[PDB]
Amino acid sequence: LLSTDIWVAALIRRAELGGAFATVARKGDARAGAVLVKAVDRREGTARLFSEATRGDGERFWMQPVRSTFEPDLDAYAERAARIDPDIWVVEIEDRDGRHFLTEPVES
User: Fold this and answer.
1) Which of 70, 56, 63 is nearest to 35 (CA)?
2) What ranges do the domains of the chain cover?
3) Which CATH architecture has domain 1-108?
4) Beta partners for 95?
5) How far apart are CA 51 and CA 100, in angstroms?
6) CA-CA distances (angstroms) from residue 92 to 1, 57, 58?
7) Which superkingdom does the taxonomy of this entry point to (predicted)?
């Protein structure tokens, strides 16, 4: 369907327009690479990590494959994810409200 780099450009653009700091921490495969999104809440001093999942009808949503108030656990997960999948993208978003700027549904 849509090349990952196009989707990543839209996410970065949206986050930057919202006042967040958004950067590509790992540039994966342009056309079909999976994406990890690390959303850091600057105010609460906490962070979340989102990975891709699908519903029994093919609809895309975001799941949290690891949950921790200790940010280095999310960094440990991202490093392992890039060994498991060398085509993976990692996008880090730093926002005053911890917004992830994702348009697809998210698992709380």
Assistant:
1) 63
2) 1-108
3) 3-Layer(aba) Sandwich (3.40)
4) 41
5) 12
6) 24, 29, 26
7) Bacteria
